[PDB]
Amino acid sequence: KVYNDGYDDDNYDYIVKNGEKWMDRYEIDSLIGKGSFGQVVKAYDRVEQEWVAIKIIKNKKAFLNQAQIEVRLLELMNKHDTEMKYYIVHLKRHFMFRNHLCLVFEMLSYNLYDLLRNTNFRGVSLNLTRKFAQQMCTALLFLATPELSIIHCDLKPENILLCNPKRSAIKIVDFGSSCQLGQRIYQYIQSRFYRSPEVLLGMPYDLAIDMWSLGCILVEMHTGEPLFSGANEVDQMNKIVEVLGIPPAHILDQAPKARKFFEKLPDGTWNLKKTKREYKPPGTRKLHNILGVETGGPGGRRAGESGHTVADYLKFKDLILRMLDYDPKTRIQPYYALQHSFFKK
Ligand SMILES: COc1ccc2c3ccnc(C(F)(F)F)c3n(CCCCN)c2c1
């Protein structure tokens, strides 16, 4: 029993062969990525004389149609003149090859999860965290340009890659989960650890959910550890509450899924549901201590390092708390984030 003549496995993926030449142009080197989606390969373009990453989509209607969304959004980004688009991975061209849609991207280096692995999850400096933070704020500003209004819907360290392994330049990848501002379709979105409270509560959402994710990410880059590591949605909300307290009454009064995590007392105020004592009381796990503002950084491991002063840590703390505002209408936006004192030289 064969699939697609030679060419596919029993699972609609193209069977990758090292050394194969496509369309008398692309020399396939190796398999570098897997997903649901299909595969990613490192390949040499003989014509243009450069390495590329090729995203080979499964030969199956559902994934093809998903990738065409990705293509459409990238091509939309492509027609904008500004320099801010460089923080998004660039789609060079696409083509069908043996019944698989193939997206050709510029070749990048490792992602920010791999970078943490090399620190043994002890985190990178605050100077480097800042460089990443500034570039991401700029990328979100670009996505926010009115004619795009794109929500990535899945920011996490895995989906932010270095351009070069010895430099700090980064880009966002994978717009297959994305959408534009408009009428709600999707409700179960964002990777759990990076999932915003408006999504957890079943409420309306907008581009601000990406800023929440960024907040969680930047802390995790410096500590090496995820800020909110929930095993399920209840645990995820409880871990959020440990740091940031009970969310405001006016929000919870409108949440469809309010009662999944909370109960409204006879006097109108909201509490956690009682579900073996486990969590720290509401708002007692202060971000102040997580970052180690006055105690030499996370685990005290930055004591005596330059570029880790108390003054520097306070600016970081402030910016992060603005990204982790419970209210998506007052949560800081990209244009104003870029003006914060954490970026003044
Ligand atoms: C090595 O350089 C690149 C360059 C671009 C991409 C890219 C673009 C879109 N989607 C993905 C993927 F993550 F596989 F979904 C991409 N990936 C895969 C991410 C690597 C981990 N699976 C890319 C990798």
Coordinates of C-alpha atoms in Angstrom, one line a residue, residues 45 59 65 81 83 88 96 122 128 164 186 193 215 219 236 243 260 300-301 307 320 331 333:
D45 CA 18.6 27.4 -3.0
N59 CA -1.2 16.6 1.7
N65 CA -6.5 25.5 3.9
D81 CA 6.8 49.7 3.5
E83 CA 11.2 48.7 8.8
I88 CA 8.4 39.0 11.5
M96 CA 3.0 23.2 -4.9
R122 CA 18.6 29.8 34.9
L128 CA 19.6 40.7 26.8
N164 CA 22.0 34.4 14.2
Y186 CA -12.2 30.9 18.2
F193 CA 1.0 29.1 30.3
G215 CA 4.6 39.8 29.8
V219 CA 9.8 37.3 33.0
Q236 CA -3.6 28.3 35.5
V243 CA 0.8 36.9 41.9
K260 CA -15.3 28.0 36.8
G300 CA 20.2 35.6 44.0
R301 CA 22.2 34.6 41.0
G307 CA 23.5 46.0 34.5
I320 CA 5.8 43.9 33.3
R331 CA -3.2 47.1 29.6
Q333 CA -0.1 49.1 24.2

